């Protein structure tokens, strides 16, 4: 029958979970041969001026940075970006896995390994006129249910020898100098899709967020691969933010976002500089190269002590709060690992700097005495210089292997970055009483971008829901 009351259906936006390719938006000049510019020209969408955000009201959503697929998607883009951008002079990657040749093609003699001897023995030559078709070999660490080593026939263009098989696959290709300048990259959801952005000043990357907005695109992010220190990332709106899925678990890393950035300045590679020196007036010996100085491999990373010291103090206080007040907070150098793990490795200009973070991570904060000592040392000093080295052969972060690149031509510039976060790994374990020890960590590049995408969630939009008056 209806009533005098008029019911108006409210076009309430409805949001549903979806995963799709995020379209990278960036402002870059096609003419430039720069790595990021050429990539943008190859595949990007223009960044819209003043996009703004649409704020959703009375909407609360549970966010999970770790679960957020966008991170994986971006990481894949990062991997592709680097692989095309930088071509090694020599690429080393293992080919074949745990394959050991015990018999060579065209052998009629069965050869067998003997464990007790530690040597190969001629098991027996075949009476019948049969010659081995393919390379016969055993697979290390592979045991059948029968308790037998798995044996895999190998067909190669060239016959491998007994006791061999499994090469380093040397790949040799051009490695010309290519300019690498990180350019912020926005990510925009495809039409019919939106990005939900948590607007909380302090959010740990997980849990319900009441303050949520719809954004077409993410904020611009520089694809910087860095170990130990998060470079040129987002700065905390409020106090230092420490994020971990499980603080209690020592294996889980702690990602620390800083309220203020810390300046890290390294120097070395740049464009070639041309100089001519006549020498000896010319006749008798003319125009060459003199003044070779030291080793270009050497570099210095300058970080202001006071700025770093305050940063450490803030982080330590936050850590102690999170864990609870009672355990000590200690910053210690890495236990070890590959150079990339051991030192703050990061790429500038297409070359990786390995900077020794030991000086950065050598402090105890539990006692006033320590605090006084640090203060006094700071007062005497000004900046901390970290020894940095550029290794032309670099361990590949994407996959297990080695990549080789050309040495720097000249110097004269400064490679600068903002330490916007710290990656901390806690030793933990039963025995570590009265103390908690944090060491710089890395190798899982995803983490670098997880911190960036923690607040971003990609959502599908379907036809608007209609809400009757109730």
């Amino acid at each position: 029958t209806e009533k005098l009351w008029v019911t108006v259906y409210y076009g309430v936006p409805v949001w549903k979970e979806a995963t799709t390719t995020l379209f990278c938006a960036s402002d870059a000049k096609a003419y430039d041969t720069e790595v990021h510019n050429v990539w943008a020209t190859h595949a990007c969408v223009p960044t819209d001026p003043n996009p703004q955000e649409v704020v959703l009201v009375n909407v609360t959503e549970n966010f999970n940075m770790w679960k957020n697929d966008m991170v994986e998607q971006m990481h894949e883009d990062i991997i592709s970006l680097w692989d095309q951008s930088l071509k090694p002079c020599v690429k080393l990657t293992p080919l074949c896995v745990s394959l050991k040749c015990t018999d060579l093609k065209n052998d009629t003699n069965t050869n067998s390994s003997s464990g007790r001897m530690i040597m190969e023995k001629g098991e027996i030559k075949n009476c019948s006129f049969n010659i081995s078709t393919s390379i016969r070999g055993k697979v290390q660490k592979e045991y059948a249910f029968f308790y037998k080593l798995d044996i895999i026939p190998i067909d190669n263009d060239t016959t491998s020898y007994k006791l061999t098989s499994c090469n380093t696959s040397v790949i040799t290709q051009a490695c010309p100098k290519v300019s690498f300048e990180p350019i912020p990259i926005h990510y925009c959801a495809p039409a019919g899709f939106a990005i939900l952005k948590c607007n909380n000043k302090t959010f740990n990357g997980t849990g319900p967020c009441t303050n949520v907005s719809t954004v077409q695109c993410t904020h611009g992010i520089r694809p910087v691969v860095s170990t130990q220190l998060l470079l040129n990332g987002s700065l905390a709106e409020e106090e230092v933010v420490i994020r971990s899925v499980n603080f209690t678990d020592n294996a889980k890393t702690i990602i620390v976002q800083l309220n203020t950035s810390v300046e890290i300045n390294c120097t070395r590679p740049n464009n070639n500089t041309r100089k001519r020196i006549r020498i000896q007036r010319g006749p008798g010996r003319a125009f060459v190269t003199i003044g070779k100085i030291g080793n270009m491999r050497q570099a210095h990373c300058n970080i202001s002590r006071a700025k770093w010291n305050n940063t450490l103090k803030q982080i330590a206080s936050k850590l102690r709060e999170q864990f609870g007040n009672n355990k000590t907070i200690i910053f210690k150098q890495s236990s070890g690992g590959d150079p990339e793990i051991v030192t703050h490795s990061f790429n500038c200009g297409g070359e990786f700097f390995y900077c020794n973070s030991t000086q950065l991570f050598n402090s105890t904060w539990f006692n006033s005495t320590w605090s006084t000592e640090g203060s006094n040392n700071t007062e005497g000093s000004d900046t901390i210089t970290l020894p940095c080295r550029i290794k032309q052969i670099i361990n590949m972060w994407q996959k297990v292997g080695k990549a080789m690149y050309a040495p720097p031509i000249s110097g004269q510039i400064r490679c600068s970055s903002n330490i916007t976060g710290l990656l901390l790994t806690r030793d933990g374990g039963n025995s570590n009483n009265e103390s908690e020890i944090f060491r710089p960590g890395g190798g899982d590049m995803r983490d670098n971008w997880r911190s960036e995408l923690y607040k971003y969630k990609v959502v599908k939009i379907e036809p608007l829901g209609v809400a009757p008056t109730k």
Partner: antibody
Amino acid sequence: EVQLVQSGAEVKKPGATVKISCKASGYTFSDFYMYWVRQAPGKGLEWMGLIDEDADTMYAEKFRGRVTITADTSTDTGYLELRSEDTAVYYCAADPWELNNVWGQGTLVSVSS
Amino acid sequence: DIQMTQSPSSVSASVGDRVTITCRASQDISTWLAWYQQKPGKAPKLLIYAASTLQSGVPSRFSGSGSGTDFSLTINSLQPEDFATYYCQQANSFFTFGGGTKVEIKR
């Protein structure tokens, strides 16, 4: 002062392993580049390669990848690697003054049946 | 790689003769060259490092010159002790040697 000492003459059969070592003295081995050069009898000098502090090495096209040059900084020593077709005299060079100067006395490697 | 060629392969000369041996780089090496003298039974000796910089103990009569892809070493007055073999080396990155020039006594 600065002396480079190369290992004694080495005689090997074809395809046999020959490793020749040069030990540095009188300068900080780690801080300076070591160079390897081979000269065949009746033939000119052929530069094999150089080694840097970080173990990063350069090689000539002929020797590219096939030869690995390794240096033991702890003993201030360098090592080479070649074959019978390259049977010859091998020189280890160093550059303490950054002038591409000092050479070693040389090692004779004879590889024959 | 880069071809380093020096010529003539051998030069016949008398004592007191002025001898020019030319080293040519197939590609522009700019200023990165070195000159070495070698004698029978002897390791290479550095006459010139950086084709313009004199090594102490080298007589003035040795005269370097040239640039880019073309360099030449001129012996102003050739002497019995000078007679020998000569090599030109690229110094920019790959220390490649030239074919070699032998200066021998003309009779």
